Amino acid sequence: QRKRQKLM
Amino acid sequence: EEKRKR
Amino acid sequence: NWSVEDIVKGINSNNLESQLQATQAARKLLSREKQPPIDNIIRAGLIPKFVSFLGKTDCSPIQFESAWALTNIASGTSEQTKAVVDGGAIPAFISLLASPHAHISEQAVWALGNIAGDGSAFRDLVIKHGAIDPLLALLAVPDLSTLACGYLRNLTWTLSNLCRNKNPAPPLDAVEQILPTLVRLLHHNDPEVLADSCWAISYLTDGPNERIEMVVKKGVVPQLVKLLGATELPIVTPALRAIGNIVTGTDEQTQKVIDAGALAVFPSLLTNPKTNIQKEATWTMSNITAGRQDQIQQVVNHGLVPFLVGVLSKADFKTQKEAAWAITNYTSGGTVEQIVYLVHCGIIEPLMNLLSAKDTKIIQVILDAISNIFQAAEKLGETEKLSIMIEECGGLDKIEALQRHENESVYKASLNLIEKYFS
């Protein structure tokens, strides 16, 4: 929840 | 009777 | 589907279009979610090049690709996020906030969110680099509905990460700067903007009563209670955490929650099928029963005492432990009449059943509350009735077993109870 990777 | 904080 | 070796060749070509294509290939690798080669990109030395591409305002595509790629590196472990920060990425992303292209500045918002989301130090380092002014300036519209939906969601989430974490809490003077925008997002009709604002508010209300008062004088308590009654669990959870945080403060801060109608929602929350909701709602009740006697009367008036009896009877053990705390705070601060009503609701039998639990602290809390009730029974002269009452539901059996086990405080309180009312 702290971090978010952006996906396709 | 004391308030508990997280 | 490039290799890292090929990406390095493209990056070091000193050909801008080749670098753009290799960076896009790197972004595609870093954006697959089953094991992206973050450490491989870092070990290749690509991060300083990616940061330098952030400032190529002539080529906005390579800005977007580098921002996306650096965002996903910063999404990983603290070591990988540190690698992004060590490459000078923070001031570059803050400059990108002013990009005329919405998707680029949106990606700078995301990246900064990932960096501040690592912990106290990086959050404070992002603030010290001046990210708050341009972040809030992106939201300087009269009506938030005119902003793109995903754009707004990304800003709210990044702002919630700037309000997150303790040791140390965020600088008060930056919380003051953020709060008005945060209240605005808290009234915005989007379930995920709502959830993230509630998280931010819950973070800010965790700690000293001075910070609680700082959120409370902005008027957010009525909105928090409104959102407490939402059907969306991702909204109720942070909303209830914020309400629970506020009632840990002064009696006046607690009264503001009660005055907003929060108690009317608690029959729902105390029987909620989600365990952490029940546990949070019961912990909140424990801190409300630790207030003034008129506030304990509000709990009685809303009919919550039967619900506290039910949580103490059948619930998750963690929830039951918070129920034991709620009863001890109740019996410690209540009137004799309120205690009499509490016993009449049938608190004794569920209280006695937890005296066999394998937890030292809960036995302390329970045995303490038994002392409390007995002390009220002495002001009615009816200690014999309570003696036979604890008799009739296997209570003395437990207390005379607890009379002799390891912990010092339990058996000291156990012998006391036995000599004083059972002889």
Residue numbers in the entry:
A (entry chain B): 435 to 442
B (entry chain C): 289 to 294
C (entry chain E): 75 to 497
Task: Give excerpts from the publication.
Nuclear translocation of the p50/p65 heterodimer is essential for NF-κB signaling. Upon activation, p50/p65 is translocated into the nucleus by the adapter importin α3 and the receptor importin β. In the classical pathway, importin α binds to importin β through its N-terminal Importin-β binding (IBB) domain8,9 and to NLS-cargos through its C-terminal 10 stacked Armadillo motifs (Arms) that collectively form an Arm-core. Importin α possesses two NLS binding pockets located along the concave Arm-core surface: an N-terminal ‘major site’ and C-terminal ‘minor site’ between Arms 2–4 and 6–8, respectively.
Similarly, the best diffraction data for importin α1 (~2.20 Å) were obtained from crystals bound to just the p50-NLS, while a complex with both the p65/p50-NLSs or just the p65-NLS diffracted to 2.40 and 2.82 Å resolution, respectively. Interestingly, adding both p65- and p50-NLS peptides to importin α3 and α1 resulted in strong electron density for the p65-NLS peptide at the minor site, with the p50-NLS firmly occupying the major NLS-site. However, there were noticeable differences between the p65-NLS conformations and contacts made with either isoform. Unexpectedly, in all complexes with importin α1, the p65-NLS adopts a fully extended conformation at the minor NLS-site, with the P1′–P4′ positions occupied by 301KRKR304 residues; the α-helix 306YETFKS311 seen in complex with importin α3 is missing in these structures. Additionally, comparing the p65-NLS in both importin α isoforms, there appears to be a shift in the NLS register at the P2′ position. In the importin α1 structures, the P2′ position is occupied by Arg302 while Lys301, Lys303, and Arg304 occupy the P1′, P3′, and P4′, respectively, and the P5′ is unoccupied. PISA55 revealed the p65-NLS:importin α3 binding (ΔG = −0.6 kcal/mol) is more energetically favorable than the p65-NLS:importin α1 (ΔG = 4.9 kcal/mol), which possibly explains the physiological preference for importin α3. Meanwhile, importin α1 residues 75–497 are perfectly superimposable (RMSD 0.26–0.39 Å) in all complexes of importin α1 bound to either p65-, p50-, and both NLSs, underscoring the rigid structure of this isoform7 that can stretch NLS peptides at the major and minor binding sites by making extensive mainchain contacts. Thus, the intrinsic plasticity of importin α3 appears to play a role in NLS-cargo specificity in contrast to the more rigid importin α1.
